Symmetry: C2
Subunit: 360 residues, 2 copies
């Protein structure tokens, strides 16, 4: 019922898989009409399912990021689709595209093709590596882009194998950055009358996520770690003088405050190895849950390293109202929250080509 | 010279550390006037060196120095907010209210003011009231799951992904709010919790517990590891011929995609047997020439020197002539204007005279 930021805006979404569609989902949550353009028979990600005992399989990649969207089914190689897409684009505020560089141009749907017809059209491109040269022309997925951008650095594994982060951080981060860039473009148009071309590379996002560590190499705080306890590990960050002193008294080790090895913070960094040893000797007297309870009650930053299975059952997780029901299946909402409207949609994903008679 | 999306907008930035200032930096790049509010001595992050935390996210901002506990600074902030379009704040829940600078305090005076709050855990109740930093929020949101360590220690990701992702999400939400105000006349309160962002980055992994593909990994070679993803039927087949193992294509253990996943341990031994005859660099060259996804697992020291890194124009220089400092630009790019700034960070309190 209440107004949403993007009411009245129409988005043509050519993207597949996760990053581009998440950006589409963010736009939907903000009130835009987002029209998926899929290959005949539907997007391939519709078929990639996970087993749910006693129930139809769950399209774990497709369903969460295409709720409340509309769908047209079209074969982009034929002349008929080209014309339908050109007519559909004349009515659009935004085009979202995530093919590898050069594709849309070969189809006759490039930024120049579409923008010559519609001077108010915002054109947004998401690629793996940028399309700025020969090395950046390649297709990629999360796992390979993450590793090529350096995200395995400094994480030792038992076998000496590079550590591969087991969630799709580059995809999901890229989705939000693209959404950000579309929003900026919409504002640019609204205020200045300029309809822009926007480009986001997953590689650039990944580099950005590691910017501080990368920076030391562009130019030729303890205790803050996980620690053994009597039972399980505890994560503690207490390196600011007030917190550090507080910590030493709380674990029953006042001697550490004035120990010349640990008294100043720089000493804590140089003698970092000795410090974790002293802390773990002291932390041995309680379980991690007990230490977490004690340290938090005294205003120190500490927590358990929860597993995914544990996270979803914590009181904090329940408190933040992070889930929605899609008719039933449970999914996670987009992170940004607003007071004057709810940035969620209850609608299910569209069936493949559901709105062909409506838009073609 | 050319118009920028946020020309004419003024932002009041109370944020510290990485997450919030990154959002401010995006706003600067998009043309906004962003005014930092710092402690009298200057933000603490100015001193944590050389300055890996402060310099990259505060270029082109202006700076005022004030002690927020005093009534004089309180009044100065209230007058300044009367002129502002956006407030960015990243203290723990309840803090700004205690200073008399909460959303109702500021929005009562300025009905067009957008108020944006970045917290660690949300502030929606008792559990989400705590302060936090990247490392602790990441572990509490589940980001150590499924990563085995030599010593059995939980694996802590050594870069600030939750901070930097949160900044972009905040920037996104501020942009949405600006459009909301522009089109619907609503000046909103915006909230982004780092925990919520962290949950979102892991959404598919979390989702399996709310309701209920090979080869794609790193592999040993003669020298170094190679990362390969070739699990799609057409790609799987190409890989087998290129590494000299046509027998693997029809091998009952590996012929179907589901089989490769079940027998991934055997698959890995067979693949590494073949990959042992060449260096990782050699395999990357060969596999890419044939349209397969493969790369080295570069270190940070290596990434910066690659031809790919150079192609994408990812760095900018801060200062003039010699002894400039190199930083990384924000990722989104635009044709009608450059989302970059040359200007250096402000000195502590540099604009005290102009704003207070």
């Amino acid at each position: 019922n209440p107004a949403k930021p993007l009411d009245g805006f129409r988005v043509l979404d050519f993207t597949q898989n996760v990053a581009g569609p998440l950006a589409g989902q963010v736009l939907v949550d903000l009130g835009a009409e987002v029209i998926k353009v899929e290959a005949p028979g539907g997007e391939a990600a519709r078929q990639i399912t996970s087993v749910l005992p006693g129930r139809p399989p769950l399209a774990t990649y497709f369903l969460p990021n295409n709720r409340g969207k509309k769908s047209v089914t079209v074969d982009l190689t034929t002349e008929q689709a080209k014309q339908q897409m050109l007519r559909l684009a004349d009515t659009a505020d935004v085009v979202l595209e995530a093919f590898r560089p050069g594709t849309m141009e070969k189809l006759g749907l490039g930024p120049d093709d579409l923008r010559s017809r519609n001077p108010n059209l915002i054109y947004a491109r998401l690629t793996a590596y940028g399309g700025n040269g020969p090395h950046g022309s390649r297709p990629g997925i999360d796992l390979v882009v993450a590793a090529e951008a350096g995200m395995t650095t400094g994480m030792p594994t038992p076998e000496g194998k590079p550590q591969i982060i087991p969630f799709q951080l580059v995809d999901n981060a890229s989705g939000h950055v693209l959404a950000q860039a579309v929003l900026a473009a919409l504002l640019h148009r609204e205020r200045n009358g300029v309809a822009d071309v926007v480009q986001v590379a997953m590689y650039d996002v990944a580099v950005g996520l590691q910017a501080n560590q990368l920076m030391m190499h562009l130019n030729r705080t303890q205790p803050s770690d996980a620690f053994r306890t009597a039972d399980g590990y505890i994560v503690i960050s207490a390196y600011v003088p007030k917190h550090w002193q507080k910590l030493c008294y709380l674990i029953g080790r006042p001697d550490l405050v004035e120990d010349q090895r640990f008294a100043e913070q720089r000493s804590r960094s140089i003698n970092y190895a000795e410090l974790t040893a002293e802390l773990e000797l002291a932390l041995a007297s309680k379980t991690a849950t007990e230490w977490v309870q004690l340290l938090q009650a005294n205003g120190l930053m500490a927590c358990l390293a929860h597993t995914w299975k544990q996270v979803v059952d914590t009181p904090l997780f329940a408190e933040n109202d992070l889930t929605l029901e899609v008719g039933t299946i449970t999914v996670i909402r987009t992170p940004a929250r607003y007071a004057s409207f709810r940035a969620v949609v209850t609608d299910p994903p569209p069936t493949a080509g559901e709105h062909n008679a409506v838009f073609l």
